[PDB]
C-alpha cells in the first residue's frame, strides 16, 4: 500500500522542483516495491520446495 | 523626417517580432524566464539552456 512504499494517499507535486524531488521519491518507492515482490517470490519458491518435500 | 519615421516603424516591428518569439507560451528570446531546464537522465538531471534575450 502507498503508505507501505512511502507515498501518502495525497502525495503529489505542485511545481517543477517538487516534481524533480518526486522523481527520486517514486524511484525509491519502485525500488522497495520490487524488493518486496522479490521476497514474496522467494517465499513462494520455499513453499513449493517444502510441498515437494512433504 | 522620412528616414526617421522609417527607423521608428522598423524599431516597432523589431519589438513586435521579438515579443512574438515564443513556442507554446515559452520562449528563449523574449527574455522572460532566465533559463530553460531540459531533461537529461533517468535521475532527472537537467540540460541547462540559458535564455538569450532578443
Automatic annotation (TrEMBL), chain B:
UniProt lineage: Bacteria, Pseudomonadati, Pseudomonadota, Alphaproteobacteria, Caulobacterales
Subunit structure of this chain's protein: In C.crescentus, the flagellar filament is composed of multiple flagellins of 29 kDa; 27 kDa and 25 kDa.
Membership in a protein family: Belongs to the bacterial flagellin family.
Gene field: fljL
Subcellular location: Secreted; Bacterial flagellum
Entry function: Flagellin is the subunit protein which polymerizes to form the filaments of bacterial flagella.
First-to-last residue of the parent protein present: 110 to 163 of 273
Name of this chain's protein: Flagellin
